[PDB]
Amino acid sequence: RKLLVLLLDGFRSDYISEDALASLPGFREIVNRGVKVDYLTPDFPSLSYPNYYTLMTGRHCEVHQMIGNYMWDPRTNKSFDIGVNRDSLMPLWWNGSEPLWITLMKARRKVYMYYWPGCEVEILGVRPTYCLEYKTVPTDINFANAVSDALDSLKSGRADLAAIYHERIDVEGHHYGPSSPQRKDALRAVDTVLKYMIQWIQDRGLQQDLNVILFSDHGMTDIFWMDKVIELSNYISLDDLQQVKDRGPVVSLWPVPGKHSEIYHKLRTVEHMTVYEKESIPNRFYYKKGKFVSPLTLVADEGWFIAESREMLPFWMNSTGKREGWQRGWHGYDNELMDMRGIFLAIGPDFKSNFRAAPIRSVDVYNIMAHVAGITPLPNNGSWSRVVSMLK
Ligand SMILES: *[C@@H]1O[C@H](CO[C@H]2O[C@@H](C)[C@@H](O)[C@@H](O)[C@@H]2O)[C@@H](O[C@@H]2O[C@H](CO)[C@@H](O)[C@H](O)[C@H]2NC(C)=O)[C@H](O)[C@H]1NC(C)=O
Ligand SMILES: *[C@@H]1O[C@H](CO)[C@@H](O[C@@H]2O[C@H](CO)[C@@H](O)[C@H](O)[C@H]2NC(C)=O)[C@H](O)[C@H]1NC(C)=O
Ligand SMILES: *[C@@H]1O[C@H](CO)[C@@H](O)[C@H](O)[C@H]1NC(C)=O
Ligand SMILES: *[C@@H]1O[C@H](CO)[C@@H](O)[C@H](O)[C@H]1NC(C)=O
Ligand SMILES: [Zn+2]
Ligand SMILES: [Zn+2]
């Protein structure tokens, strides 16, 4: 039985509340004829690359090792800078756990991936059958064409799993905030493509041969520049830092030798964030055992934003002159915050219909995908008992 997987980045749980579903006929049909969980709780940190790998390994970030969008290895002095620099392709960052598409390839099944971050990497010596590499933010038309092409590759047997990544709901949530009309517009365009998807599956006679699983990596919450910005240089000298990675809710610090205690005690006094020495990170994050986790980790309170200085803030290109746009939504915070929740839906012969499932965790999704794909899951942290009742 074929499997199509849609990762809708930054799709917050309440984007398809009852109220919202009244005007979302694509999602409403999927809910009415398939499975919808209350919400999907992401891993900490509720950032993209960590949670992509959680979703596709069933393992917490401290196990699959992809603990940040930005990571640094003191041993080799290499960085993973949100998949952009060349050294992001190093297997060093990806070989901490085998993701589902690699396991499928190794069992000699076929995998087509469309814009999926990571499909462009040789992971544990293996690559998917097809990777349409992520380069820029895919358009709504890119998304619709990728769905139609995925259906054709699954129907013809060129693919047994097809996986599609869509970013634009995340983009508009960032640029205009989670409750803005621009985010809603990007969601409506997805809803429409999902209506065509339902129609195309009927056109092509796939209804009995195909499950579709949709999920998101995290939600989105309001941020408040410039009031709720923490500037590290107000408290410490950056020259006392060997390395800093990322800006926003979760920032990794590497003090210079001899300055660890000094930097820690200076930043512990700062309100609206929490400074964790690595051995003191909260256990419920399932994060502190990751080898790339930094000696100090800064976690901002919801809505706050941490950077070296205000001028290092990630302004975006709203005017094509310089990057002067302010960000109005963000994510990455404490994964048990309501606004960080994502979604999980499923439809097809293997799933119950009109079934309101209890909320699940990001680690739970891997067992579902492996089950309907007919591959034995590698050991993981998902709970079968949390998901088993949605299956037909
Ligand atoms: C491009 O962005 C600038 C930056 O300012 C704004 O960024 C937006 C993304 C939005 O979140 C807004 O709230 C934020 O202040 C815009 O300049 C702003 O223009 C508005 C007029 O619409 C003024 O009221 C603001 O004072 C001004 N802000 C600054 C810092 O100058 C700009 O309008 C926007 N669009 C372009 C340039 O086409
Ligand atoms: C998450 O799941 C993994 C399953 O692989 C657990 O890690 C394994 O634990 C066993 C012992 O229970 C070891 O023999 C393996 O070497 C571990 N594998 C890896 C890759 O680390 C891990 O303990 C689980 N974590 C939690 C918090 O339950
Ligand atoms: C790491 O590389 C940078 C250049 O990218 C260099 O300036 C720095 O000294 C290096 N650090 C170590 C510890 O080798
Ligand atoms: C995974 O990557 C690491 C880092 O280069 C490497 O040491 C290891 O041999 C790789 N494993 C496989 C199975 O390719
Ligand atoms: Zn994301
Ligand atoms: Zn995002």
Author numbering: 24 to 415
What does the study report here?
The ecto-nucleotide pyrophosphatases/phosphodiesterases (ENPPs or NPPs) family consists of seven structurally-related ecto-enzymes. ENPP6 hydrolyzes only choline-containing lysophospholipids, such as LPC, sphingosylphosphorylcholine (SPC), platelet-activating factor (PAF) and lysoPAF, but not other lysophospholipids, suggesting that ENPP6 recognizes the choline moiety of its substrates. Here, we showed that GPC is hydrolyzed to phosphocholine by ENPP6, which is present on the extracellular surface of certain cells such as oligodendrocytes and liver sinusoid endothelial cells. In addition, we showed that ENPP6-deficient mice have impaired myelin structure and are prone to having a fatty liver, which are typical symptoms of choline deficiency. Together, these results strongly suggest that ENPP6 serves as a choline-supplying enzyme.
